[PDB]
Design a protein around this motif. Structure first.
Motif, PDB file in Angstrom:
ATOM      1  N   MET A  72       0.738  -0.997  -0.195  1.00  0.00           N
ATOM      2  CA  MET A  72       0.782  -0.072  -0.231  1.00  0.00           C
ATOM      3  C   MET A  72       0.947   1.239   0.175  1.00  0.00           C
ATOM      4  SD  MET A  72      -2.907   1.268   2.605  1.00  0.00           S
ATOM      5  CE  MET A  72      -1.762   1.145   3.941  1.00  0.00           C
ATOM      6  N   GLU A  73       0.853   2.408  -0.981  1.00  0.00           N
ATOM      7  CA  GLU A  73       1.337   3.679  -1.025  1.00  0.00           C
ATOM      8  C   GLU A  73       0.957   3.919  -0.187  1.00  0.00           C
ATOM      9  N   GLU A  74       1.485   5.283   0.587  1.00  0.00           N
ATOM     10  CA  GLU A  74       1.928   6.573   1.755  1.00  0.00           C
ATOM     11  C   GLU A  74       1.879   7.317   0.786  1.00  0.00           C
ATOM     12  OE1 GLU A  74       3.294   5.391   5.064  1.00  0.00           O
ATOM     13  OE2 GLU A  74       2.618   7.010   6.282  1.00  0.00           O
ATOM     14  N   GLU A  75       0.747   8.639   1.143  1.00  0.00           N
ATOM     15  CA  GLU A  75       1.339   9.879  -0.063  1.00  0.00           C
ATOM     16  C   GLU A  75       0.609  10.934   1.007  1.00  0.00           C
ATOM     17  OE1 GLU A  75       0.191   8.728  -4.660  1.00  0.00           O
ATOM     18  OE2 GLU A  75      -0.405  10.851  -3.247  1.00  0.00           O
ATOM     19  N   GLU A  76       2.089  12.038   0.996  1.00  0.00           N
ATOM     20  CA  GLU A  76       1.527  13.088   2.205  1.00  0.00           C
ATOM     21  C   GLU A  76       0.320  14.164   1.012  1.00  0.00           C
ATOM     22  OE1 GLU A  76       3.852  14.648   4.959  1.00  0.00           O
ATOM     23  OE2 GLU A  76       3.800  17.140   3.602  1.00  0.00           O
ATOM     24  N   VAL A  77      -0.708  14.943   2.166  1.00  0.00           N
ATOM     25  CA  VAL A  77      -1.687  15.813   1.932  1.00  0.00           C
ATOM     26  C   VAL A  77      -1.063  17.076   2.508  1.00  0.00           C
ATOM     27  CG1 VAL A  77      -3.408  14.983   2.475  1.00  0.00           C
ATOM     28  CG2 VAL A  77      -3.441  16.147   0.497  1.00  0.00           C
ATOM     29  N   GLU A  78      -0.921  18.013   1.840  1.00  0.00           N
ATOM     30  CA  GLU A  78      -1.599  19.188   2.567  1.00  0.00           C
ATOM     31  C   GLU A  78      -2.685  20.456   2.140  1.00  0.00           C
ATOM     32  OE1 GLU A  78       3.281  20.167   2.266  1.00  0.00           O
ATOM     33  OE2 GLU A  78       2.275  21.231   4.290  1.00  0.00           O
ATOM     34  N   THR A  79      -3.070  20.351   3.680  1.00  0.00           N
ATOM     35  CA  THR A  79      -4.200  21.603   3.040  1.00  0.00           C
ATOM     36  C   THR A  79      -4.553  22.730   3.293  1.00  0.00           C
ATOM     37  OG1 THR A  79      -5.972  19.051   3.685  1.00  0.00           O
ATOM     38  CG2 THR A  79      -6.976  21.048   3.717  1.00  0.00           C
ATOM     39  N   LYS A 111       6.024  20.989 -12.312  1.00  0.00           N
ATOM     40  CA  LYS A 111       7.208  20.326 -11.913  1.00  0.00           C
ATOM     41  C   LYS A 111       8.286  21.371 -13.147  1.00  0.00           C
ATOM     42  CE  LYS A 111      10.679  17.722 -11.151  1.00  0.00           C
ATOM     43  NZ  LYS A 111      12.059  18.458 -11.813  1.00  0.00           N
ATOM     44  N   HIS A 112       8.880  21.976 -11.929  1.00  0.00           N
ATOM     45  CA  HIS A 112      10.151  22.803 -11.517  1.00  0.00           C
ATOM     46  C   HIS A 112      11.114  22.096 -11.485  1.00  0.00           C
ATOM     47  CE1 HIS A 112      12.797  25.911 -10.438  1.00  0.00           C
ATOM     48  NE2 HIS A 112      12.062  26.827 -11.175  1.00  0.00           N
ATOM     49  N   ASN A 113      12.436  22.857 -12.172  1.00  0.00           N
ATOM     50  CA  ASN A 113      14.191  22.008 -11.717  1.00  0.00           C
ATOM     51  C   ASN A 113      14.893  22.276 -11.007  1.00  0.00           C
ATOM     52  OD1 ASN A 113      14.474  21.491 -14.821  1.00  0.00           O
ATOM     53  ND2 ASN A 113      15.609  23.870 -15.571  1.00  0.00           N
ATOM     54  N   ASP A 114      13.794  22.729  -9.492  1.00  0.00           N
ATOM     55  CA  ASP A 114      13.675  22.795  -8.593  1.00  0.00           C
ATOM     56  C   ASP A 114      13.525  22.079  -7.573  1.00  0.00           C
ATOM     57  OD1 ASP A 114      16.451  24.777  -9.870  1.00  0.00           O
ATOM     58  OD2 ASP A 114      15.431  26.482  -8.172  1.00  0.00           O
ATOM     59  N   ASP A 115      12.712  21.214  -7.970  1.00  0.00           N
ATOM     60  CA  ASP A 115      11.938  20.838  -7.068  1.00  0.00           C
ATOM     61  C   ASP A 115      10.848  18.967  -7.573  1.00  0.00           C
ATOM     62  OD1 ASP A 115      10.334  19.774  -4.030  1.00  0.00           O
ATOM     63  OD2 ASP A 115       9.010  21.790  -4.951  1.00  0.00           O
ATOM     64  N   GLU A 116       9.941  18.648  -7.065  1.00  0.00           N
ATOM     65  CA  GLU A 116       9.646  17.359  -7.967  1.00  0.00           C
ATOM     66  C   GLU A 116       8.553  17.794  -7.946  1.00  0.00           C
ATOM     67  OE1 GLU A 116       9.460  15.102  -3.930  1.00  0.00           O
ATOM     68  OE2 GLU A 116      11.084  13.875  -4.209  1.00  0.00           O
ATOM     69  N   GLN A 117       7.727  16.890  -8.929  1.00  0.00           N
ATOM     70  CA  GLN A 117       6.029  16.778  -9.207  1.00  0.00           C
ATOM     71  C   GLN A 117       5.461  16.985  -8.309  1.00  0.00           C
ATOM     72  OE1 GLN A 117       6.001  15.313 -12.988  1.00  0.00           O
ATOM     73  NE2 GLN A 117       3.634  14.920 -12.687  1.00  0.00           N
ATOM     74  N   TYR A 118       3.932  18.598  -8.136  1.00  0.00           N
ATOM     75  CA  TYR A 118       3.810  18.216  -7.351  1.00  0.00           C
ATOM     76  C   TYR A 118       2.002  18.664  -7.890  1.00  0.00           C
ATOM     77  CZ  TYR A 118       6.898  18.979  -3.502  1.00  0.00           C
ATOM     78  OH  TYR A 118       7.472  18.538  -2.728  1.00  0.00           O
ATOM     79  N   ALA A 119       0.638  18.434  -7.177  1.00  0.00           N
ATOM     80  CA  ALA A 119      -0.348  18.354  -7.849  1.00  0.00           C
ATOM     81  C   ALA A 119      -1.108  19.176  -6.756  1.00  0.00           C
ATOM     82  CB  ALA A 119      -1.681  17.241  -7.609  1.00  0.00           C
ATOM     83  N   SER A 129     -10.664  25.770   0.810  1.00  0.00           N
ATOM     84  CA  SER A 129      -9.621  25.429   0.644  1.00  0.00           C
ATOM     85  C   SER A 129      -8.869  24.968  -0.932  1.00  0.00           C
ATOM     86  CB  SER A 129      -9.532  23.963   1.505  1.00  0.00           C
ATOM     87  OG  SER A 129      -9.993  25.002   2.977  1.00  0.00           O
ATOM     88  N   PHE A 130      -7.653  24.569  -0.334  1.00  0.00           N
ATOM     89  CA  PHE A 130      -7.163  23.918  -1.810  1.00  0.00           C
ATOM     90  C   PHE A 130      -6.240  22.897  -0.895  1.00  0.00           C
ATOM     91  CE2 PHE A 130      -2.785  26.156  -1.682  1.00  0.00           C
ATOM     92  CZ  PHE A 130      -2.983  26.919  -1.643  1.00  0.00           C
ATOM     93  N   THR A 131      -5.624  21.839  -2.033  1.00  0.00           N
ATOM     94  CA  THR A 131      -4.134  20.972  -1.286  1.00  0.00           C
ATOM     95  C   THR A 131      -3.614  20.915  -2.581  1.00  0.00           C
ATOM     96  OG1 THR A 131      -5.429  18.925  -2.710  1.00  0.00           O
ATOM     97  CG2 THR A 131      -6.357  18.938  -0.427  1.00  0.00           C
TER      98      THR A 131
END
Ligand SMILES: Nc1ncnc2c1ncn2[C@@H]1O[C@H](COP(=O)(O)CP(=O)(O)O)[C@@H](O)[C@H]1O
Ligand SMILES: [Mg+2]
Length: 215
Positions: free
Chosen positions: A2-9, A143-151, A159-161
């Motif tokens: 099972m994959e664990e994924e982090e989310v921030e609200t 996706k920016h050169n300095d970071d990972e890919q985000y949604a 709110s947004f996540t």
């Protein structure tokens, strides 16, 4: 396993929430300008990577072609605007798309209240939120050169996540996916798309391609 994924609200800044509510719950004619605002953001992001890359060519390792794709999907009722611009870091998403006050927000809501055309949104530093003229939900993959890919994602309501994106890798750039409201499906028609680009996005300095799934 099972994959664990982090989310921030996150809470939108109060006036940004107020503007989102106004755009969503008021009738505006001329809603087609949402596309102009999103392409002009892609254009600005492409300006950014082109100039960064004069300074350092290795910023194009993540991909050399500087362009904009438009992808209407009549099946899932989404219109996706993809660019190979500079992209956004995590912090760029959090700060620029919702947490930090924009200096023009209050002036724009007064303008609108006084009966300005929603087209004016481009002058007030808040044109991203015109996506909510036509979309009930917006997902931004980046996706920016300095970071990972985000949604980033928001159905508005305050709110947004933001979460690491473990979907399809993009090399560099941004993908805005509009989940269109049921009465705004004209924006998936290739003729309407063409019409509004020609009208409003005619002098953009990078190639734009429209991808149409075979009827
Ligand atoms: N396609 C994209 N690529 C990179 N950054 C983007 C983007 N779309 C929006 N952004 C970020 O979101 C900010 C706010 O976009 P707006 O159109 O709301 C106001 P403005 O900065 O364009 O005058 C942009 O300044 C940019 O930092
Ligand atoms: Mg903009």
């Amino acid at each position: 396993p099972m994959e664990e994924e982090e989310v921030e609200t996150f809470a939108f800044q109060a006036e940004i929430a107020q503007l989102m509510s106004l755009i969503i719950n008021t009738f505006y004619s001329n809603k087609e300008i949402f596309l102009r605002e999103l392409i002009s953001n892609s254009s600005d992001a492409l300006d950014k990577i082109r100039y960064e890359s004069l300074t350092d060519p290795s910023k194009l390792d993540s991909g050399k072609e500087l362009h904009i794709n438009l992808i209407p999907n009549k099946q899932d009722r989404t219109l996706t605007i993809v660019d190979t611009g500079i992209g956004m870091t995590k912090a760029d998403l959090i700060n620029n798309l919702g947490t930090i006050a924009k200096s023009g927000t209050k002036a724009f809501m007064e303008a609108l209240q006084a009966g300005a055309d929603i087209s004016m949104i481009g002058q007030f530093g808040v044109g991203f939120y015109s996506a909510y003229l036509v979309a009930e939900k917006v997902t931004v993959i980046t996706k920016h050169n300095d970071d990972e890919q985000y949604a980033w994602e928001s159905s508005a309501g305050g709110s947004f996540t933001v979460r690491t994106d473990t979907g399809e890798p993009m090399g560099r750039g941004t993908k805005v996916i509009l989940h269109l409201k049921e009465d705004q499906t004209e924006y998936l028609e290739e003729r309407r798309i063409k019409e509004i680009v020609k009208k409003h996005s005619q002098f953009i300095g990078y190639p734009i391609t429209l991808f149409v799934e075979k009827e």
